[PDB]
From Swiss-Prot:
Name of the protein: Copper metallothionein 1-1
Gene this chain is encoded by: CUP1-1
Note on domains (UniProt): Contains 1 metal-binding domain: 6 to 8 copper ions are chelated within a single copper-thiolate cluster and are coordinated via cysteinyl thiolate bridges to 10 cysteine ligands. 6 copper ions are trigonally coordinated, whereas the other 2 are only digonally coordinated.
Residues holding Cu cation 6: C14, C20, C38
UniProt source species: Saccharomyces cerevisiae (strain ATCC 204508 / S288c) (Baker's yeast)
Full protein segment contained here: 9 to 48 of 61
Residues reported in the UniProt entry to bind Cu cation 7: C24, C26, C38
Chain sites annotated for binding Cu cation 8: C26, C30, C36
Residues annotated to bind Cu cation 2: C7, C20
């Protein structure tokens, strides 16, 4: 669960919706769409 980072999602849901831009284990590399089952 490595989500102690800055939301690094290059999507439109994270890059914008800051409701989940602070606790997602996305390994600051998330750059795909079927690799973002993030909701927080
Ligand atoms: Ag994220
Ligand atoms: Ag995302
Ligand atoms: Ag992403
Ligand atoms: Ag996200
Ligand atoms: Ag986010
Ligand atoms: Ag995420
Ligand atoms: Ag993601």
């Amino acid at each position: 669960q490595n989500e102690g980072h800055e939301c690094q999602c290059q999507c439109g849901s994270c890059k914008n919706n800051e409701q989940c831009q602070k606790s997602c284990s996305c390994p600051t590399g998330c750059n795909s769409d079927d690799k973002c089952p993030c909701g927080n």
